[PDB]
Design an enzyme around this catalytic site. Structure first.
Site, PDB file in Angstrom:
ATOM      1  N   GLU A 260       7.921  -0.844  -0.284  1.00  0.00           N
ATOM      2  CA  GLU A 260       7.905   0.024  -1.460  1.00  0.00           C
ATOM      3  C   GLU A 260       7.101   1.289  -1.188  1.00  0.00           C
ATOM      4  O   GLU A 260       7.508   2.389  -1.567  1.00  0.00           O
ATOM      5  CB  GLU A 260       7.314  -0.724  -2.652  1.00  0.00           C
ATOM      6  CG  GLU A 260       8.281  -1.643  -3.353  1.00  0.00           C
ATOM      7  CD  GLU A 260       9.502  -0.928  -3.841  1.00  0.00           C
ATOM      8  OE1 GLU A 260      10.620  -1.416  -3.586  1.00  0.00           O
ATOM      9  OE2 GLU A 260       9.347   0.127  -4.483  1.00  0.00           O
TER      10      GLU A 260
ATOM     11  N   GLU B 163       0.642  -6.894 -10.303  1.00  0.00           N
ATOM     12  CA  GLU B 163       1.780  -6.810 -11.212  1.00  0.00           C
ATOM     13  C   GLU B 163       2.994  -7.550 -10.657  1.00  0.00           C
ATOM     14  O   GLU B 163       3.724  -8.197 -11.414  1.00  0.00           O
ATOM     15  CB  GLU B 163       2.070  -5.339 -11.522  1.00  0.00           C
ATOM     16  CG  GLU B 163       3.160  -5.056 -12.540  1.00  0.00           C
ATOM     17  CD  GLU B 163       4.540  -5.048 -11.934  1.00  0.00           C
ATOM     18  OE1 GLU B 163       4.637  -4.772 -10.729  1.00  0.00           O
ATOM     19  OE2 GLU B 163       5.517  -5.345 -12.640  1.00  0.00           O
ATOM     20  N   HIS B 164       3.260  -7.430  -9.354  1.00  0.00           N
ATOM     21  CA  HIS B 164       4.339  -8.246  -8.797  1.00  0.00           C
ATOM     22  C   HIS B 164       3.996  -9.729  -8.778  1.00  0.00           C
ATOM     23  O   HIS B 164       4.886 -10.569  -8.928  1.00  0.00           O
ATOM     24  CB  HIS B 164       4.702  -7.821  -7.385  1.00  0.00           C
ATOM     25  CG  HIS B 164       5.446  -6.536  -7.314  1.00  0.00           C
ATOM     26  ND1 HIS B 164       6.653  -6.422  -6.663  1.00  0.00           N
ATOM     27  CD2 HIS B 164       5.163  -5.310  -7.801  1.00  0.00           C
ATOM     28  CE1 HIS B 164       7.084  -5.179  -6.756  1.00  0.00           C
ATOM     29  NE2 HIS B 164       6.198  -4.484  -7.444  1.00  0.00           N
TER      30      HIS B 164
ATOM     31  N   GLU C  30       4.892 -11.160  -1.713  1.00  0.00           N
ATOM     32  CA  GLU C  30       5.068  -9.971  -2.539  1.00  0.00           C
ATOM     33  C   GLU C  30       4.244  -8.794  -2.047  1.00  0.00           C
ATOM     34  O   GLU C  30       4.663  -7.644  -2.203  1.00  0.00           O
ATOM     35  CB  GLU C  30       4.654 -10.261  -3.984  1.00  0.00           C
ATOM     36  CG  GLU C  30       5.429 -11.354  -4.696  1.00  0.00           C
ATOM     37  CD  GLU C  30       6.872 -10.994  -4.970  1.00  0.00           C
ATOM     38  OE1 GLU C  30       7.125  -9.882  -5.475  1.00  0.00           O
ATOM     39  OE2 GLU C  30       7.751 -11.842  -4.712  1.00  0.00           O
TER      40      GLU C  30
ATOM     41  N   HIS D 195      -0.715  -2.928  -8.359  1.00  0.00           N
ATOM     42  CA  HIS D 195       0.728  -2.982  -8.193  1.00  0.00           C
ATOM     43  C   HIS D 195       1.149  -4.328  -7.614  1.00  0.00           C
ATOM     44  O   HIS D 195       2.099  -4.955  -8.104  1.00  0.00           O
ATOM     45  CB  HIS D 195       1.167  -1.815  -7.313  1.00  0.00           C
ATOM     46  CG  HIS D 195       2.647  -1.682  -7.159  1.00  0.00           C
ATOM     47  ND1 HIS D 195       3.225  -0.991  -6.117  1.00  0.00           N
ATOM     48  CD2 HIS D 195       3.668  -2.119  -7.930  1.00  0.00           C
ATOM     49  CE1 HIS D 195       4.539  -1.022  -6.244  1.00  0.00           C
ATOM     50  NE2 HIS D 195       4.834  -1.702  -7.337  1.00  0.00           N
TER      51      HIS D 195
END
Length: 966
Positions: free
Chosen positions: A175, A77-78, A150, A74
């Site tokens: 998140e 991906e960012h 990030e 994740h």
């Protein structure tokens, strides 16, 4: 001339840019031909779906199988969207979002794969986005400081003061904080983890907040080098653009630079249990509920076969829909109408995201004493289904529903196909076999006609004899989050104590360089971009014909290639309705087609709706006029859908609903109102900025006040109040009163979208339906604070501007998009820390500023003030205006499906002449007009403001006498 005709010319064994054609299959029910290629040197797989649809889509898929709960795919991906080798500029993704004519550009990370899709209608824009996506995924600069921004980092509470203690910061960190404030995500995550506890499905793929700081930069770089290699990739394209151009770009930009590896990434099969298991977990008590003893959720889950064998998965998915969907399902009659709970458990029905799919059913909102009662109900219900089976009408309804989803024409069809085949393709399945729905339906019909107990043996095998059962219950603890705070603070102290002062100064200096990175305006001119000269000056005219019928109802017929589908709509005004009954109109629309009509009870009515139509719904709409701020249209839109052959049945259904609706069915009505109220309470966070912007705009225009009444927080509060009433009868008496004002033909207009070959029969059926039915505001400022128990805020500010047909409106739209792209995005998101934030301009003329998940409140309105001062300052270039025009034309020219072409003429009354006039105003907007409109309307004191905030307590706000707290 067509796409699938030239696509059928690809012969097996043809070598095209390093790829080899392995399989070509015609899929006539989807009007497409699938082509499967593999790159010989690398082993990358390619599936191309050629269909004559101008909305072309690309997607690339990587298999990411995490083995810890750090969240590495994740965060990766960012991180890949922050810079690449050929485009070293900052944030290529969002910068290309304003330099392209795309309709969609995003990325998804599932549990065991990551997916990067985009779609656009311009072939040069396609080449540009394809180059940026290939470069972002395969050759990113993986700078450590971008990973600190990030992912996760240590940061002081004031980044300029190195003597205050260090705390955790990070985008993904918050998140996952927001992931585990959600009780549904705790339930879903623990369910998946407990049912498949052997391998990668046993961990929290998104990241456990207590286990997230174990990820280092080197581990992230190794994860990228191991999983984002083209031998571990699946490429997918859909649409009419020539395939050869795509293959030439893929080969010359990405695949040539790599060599063959063997991914050790296959997910092994879950070893079957010998004995069922029970687990108990805890979650956070929800504050929207009013009773604490009725907050338990329980579920029972069953392990089903793999998604590889397509047939058995299709069969069990149909069986799961037969078991749980609608008031005619066994589990609805056993669980919902038992009055033990409030709604189905999360992830109810068939869940086919994991390798082995699983079925789940249960209730939420039960008292903890009823857990064994629910488990016995589920067991007894399975026994009754084993002994009695299913009636044939529900099987026909299900096969008809799937046929409708097969034939219906959406605007994002390619997105649905890549999401629908990603999971099967990820585990070395054949994605072409999922596309042949006609074949599987034929085989299903044959398997039912040959063995009358086929579904009875399937439920027997997978429910009565399947020992791989999981019973999981969840009850909240009032002190859960303090425990959570303790454990995160314990890991925090454990990691901060081991740092040396030189390490702390390195963290401080990186923090100041990071703040400069977030502050200094940088150049993005190395990215490719489109020009205004590539935007079409005129749109193709949409043909309509209005026929007055029976004897004065206008009916709009629009011949469209809808592929045998008929879409019927009717809009009935509310101008005659007494003002007392306005707030119950959403309730009226939400229950009108679910209570029974004429001689049909609610079960039979639901069976008829699912068997003849594709769905029949009603919803209230407020349509403002385009040339007067204080003129609006209020009404209800009845919308339905059916196949060509079932049209007279549909219109007979509409006549029976219009003439004899069953307002006496009280027991099912109480179920529907409590379910709608629960659904409204669950949906507040995802539409928080919508509710805030609607509340801020209540006091500016009459249309705004009515929109607050129909769809604001007033509707949620009203639904909760009605759902707490013990005697529902005084609410039920209000429905005939609304019925006598709405369901008639006095102020009605209709629309029909169908194929031209079907049109005369459709004109007859509608004309038969129409014969069968009866015959100065001064705005004032307001500040509103909803005290909500949220961990984030939602802020909205509304400003009253000119309507659509005013020449300044197009300039305002450009200004709004300009401000969003070049000020508010950086300040609120990167600097502020909010998940989403920007400015929007509505059709009625309300200029709305919004923030989504913002940790701040006062600073948000202050940044709005600094943003309007920036807009008046003129500190923007001509290229920024070019980017704003591009983004607006990327929005207004978004593709419209045959079912809503043309909807704007039917609802808002905007002709093609009006759209062309607004399009030429968007072309003629210049820099001086942007300065003129910025000094005329957005400036302080020139117009009326409105403010609303959803979020946690703010003491300073409580001491502000100009605020009203609700």
């Amino acid at each position: 001339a067509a796409a699938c005709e030239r696509a059928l010319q690809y012969k097996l064994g043809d070598k095209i840019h390093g790829f080899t054609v392995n399989q070509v299959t015609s899929v006539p029910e989807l009007f497409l031909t699938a082509v499967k290629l593999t790159h010989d040197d690398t082993g990358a797989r390619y599936l191309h779906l050629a269909r004559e649809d101008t909305n072309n889509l690309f997607s690339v898929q990587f298999r990411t199988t995490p083995m810890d709960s750090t969240g590495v795919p994740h965060i990766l991906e960012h991180t890949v969207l922050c810079g690449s080798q050929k485009y070293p500029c900052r944030d290529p993704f969002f910068k290309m979002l304003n330099r392209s004519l795309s309709t969609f550009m995003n990325a998804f990370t599932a549990s065991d794969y990551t997916l990067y899709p985009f779609s656009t209608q311009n072939p040069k824009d396609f080449q540009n986005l394809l180059s940026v996506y290939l470069d972002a995924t395969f050759f990113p600069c993986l700078r450590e400081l971008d990973f600190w921004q990030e992912g996760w980092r240590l940061e002081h509470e004031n980044p300029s003061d190195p003597q205050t203690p260090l705390v955790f910061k990070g985008v993904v960190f918050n998140e996952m904080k927001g992931a585990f404030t959600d009780n549904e995500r705790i339930f879903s995550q623990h369910l998946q983890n407990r049912l498949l506890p052997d391998h990668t499905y046993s961990v929290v793929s998104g990241g456990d907040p207590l286990c997230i700081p174990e990820l280092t930069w080197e581990q992230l770089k190794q994860f990228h080098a191991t999983h984002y290699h083209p031998s571990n990739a699946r490429f997918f394209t859909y649409g009419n653009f020539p395939l050869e151009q795509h293959l030439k770009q893929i080969h010359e930009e990405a695949l040539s630079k790599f060599q063959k590896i063997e991914p050790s990434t296959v997910v092994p099969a879950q070893t079957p249990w010998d004995k069922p298991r029970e687990f108990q977990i805890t979650c956070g008590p929800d504050s929207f509920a009013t009773d604490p003893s009725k907050q338990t959720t329980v579920s029972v889950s069953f392990l089903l076969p793999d998604i590889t064998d397509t047939f058995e998965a299709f069969t069990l998915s149909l069986l799961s829909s037969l078991l749980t969907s609608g008031p005619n399902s066994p589990f609805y009659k056993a669980l919902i109408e038992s009055g033990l709970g409030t709604d189905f458990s999360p992830d109810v029905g068939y869940n086919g995201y994991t390798r082995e799919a699983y079925f789940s059913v249960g209730l939420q909102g039960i008292v903890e004493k009823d857990i064994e009662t629910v488990r016995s109900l589920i067991d007894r219900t399975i026994d009754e289904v084993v002994e009695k089976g299913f009636e044939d009408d529900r099987i026909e309804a299900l096969l008809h529903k799937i046929e409708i989803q097969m034939k219906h024409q959406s605007t994002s069809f390619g997105l649905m196909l890549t999401s629908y085949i990603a999971s099967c393709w990820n585990h070395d399945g054949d994605p072409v076999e999922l596309l042949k729905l006609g074949n599987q339906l034929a085989k299903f019909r044959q398997c039912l006609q040959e063995n009358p107990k086929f579904l009875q043996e399937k439920v027997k095998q997978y429910f009565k004899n399947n020992q791989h059962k999981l019973t999981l219950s969840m009850r909240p603890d009032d002190k859960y989050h303090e425990k959570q705070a303790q454990v995160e603070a314990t890991k925090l102290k454990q990691k901060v104590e081991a740092l040396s002062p030189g390490d702390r100064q390195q963290i401080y200096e990186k923090g100041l360089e990071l703040r400069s990175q977030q502050s200094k305006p940088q150049d993005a001119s190395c990215l490719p971009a489109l020009k205004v000269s590539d935007i079409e000056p005129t749109i193709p005219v949409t043909e309509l014909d209005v026929v007055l019928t029976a004897g004065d109802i206008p009916v709009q017929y629009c011949a469209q290639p809808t592929n045998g589908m008929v879409y019927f709509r009717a809009f009935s005004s509310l101008n005659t309705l007494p003002e007392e009954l306005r707030p119950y109109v959403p309730l009226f629309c939400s229950v009108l087609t679910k209570l029974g009509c004429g001689l049909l009870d609610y079960r039979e009515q639901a069976q008829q709706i699912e068997l003849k139509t594709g769905g029949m719904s009603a919803s209230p709409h407020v349509l403002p006029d385009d040339s007067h701020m204080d003129t609006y249209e209020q009404g209800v839109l009845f919308s339905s859908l059916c196949l060509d052959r079932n049209l007279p049945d549909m219109m007979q259904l509409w006549s029976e609903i219009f003439n004899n609706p069953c307002f006496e069915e009280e027991e099912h009505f109480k179920v529907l109102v409590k379910m709608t109220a629960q659904e409204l309470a669950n949906g507040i966070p995802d539409s928080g900025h919508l509710y805030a912007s609607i509340r801020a705009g209540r006091t500016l225009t009459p249309a705004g006040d009515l929109q607050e009444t129909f769809s604001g927080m007033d509707q949620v509060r009203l639904m909760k109040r009605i759902a707490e009433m013990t005697d529902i009868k005084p609410i039920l008496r209000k429905l005939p009163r609304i019925k006598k004002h709405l369901l008639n033909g006095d102020n009605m207009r209709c629309s029909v979208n169908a194929t031209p070959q079907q049109m005369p029969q459709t004109e007859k059926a509608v004309e038969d339906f129409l014969r069968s039915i009866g015959r100065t505001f001064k705005p004032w400022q307001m500040k509103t604070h909803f005290l909500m128990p949220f961990p984030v805020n939602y802020v909205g500010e509304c400003i009253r501007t000119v309507p659509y047909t005013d020449p300044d409106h197009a300039s305002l739209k450009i200004l709004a998009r300009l401000m969003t792209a070049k000020f508010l995005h950086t300040e609120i998101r990167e600097k502020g820390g909010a998940y989403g934030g920007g400015a929007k301009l509505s059709h009625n003329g309300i200029f709305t500023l919004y923030s989504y998940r913002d940790p701040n409140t006062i600073e948000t309105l202050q940044s709005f003030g600094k943003a309007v001062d920036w807009a008046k300052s003129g500190k923007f270039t001509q290229q920024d205006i070019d980017e704003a025009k591009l983004s607006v034309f990327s929005t207004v020219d978004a593709p419209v499906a045959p079912s809503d072409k043309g909807m704007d003429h039917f609802l808002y009354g905007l002709s093609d002449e009006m759209k062309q006039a607004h399009r030429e105003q968007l072309f003629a907007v210049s820099h001086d007009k942007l300065l003129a409109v910025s000094d005329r309307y957005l400036g302080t004191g020139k117009s009326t403001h409105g403010l609303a905030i959803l979020g946690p307590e703010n003491p300073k706000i409580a001491k502000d006498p100009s605020w009203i707290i609700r």
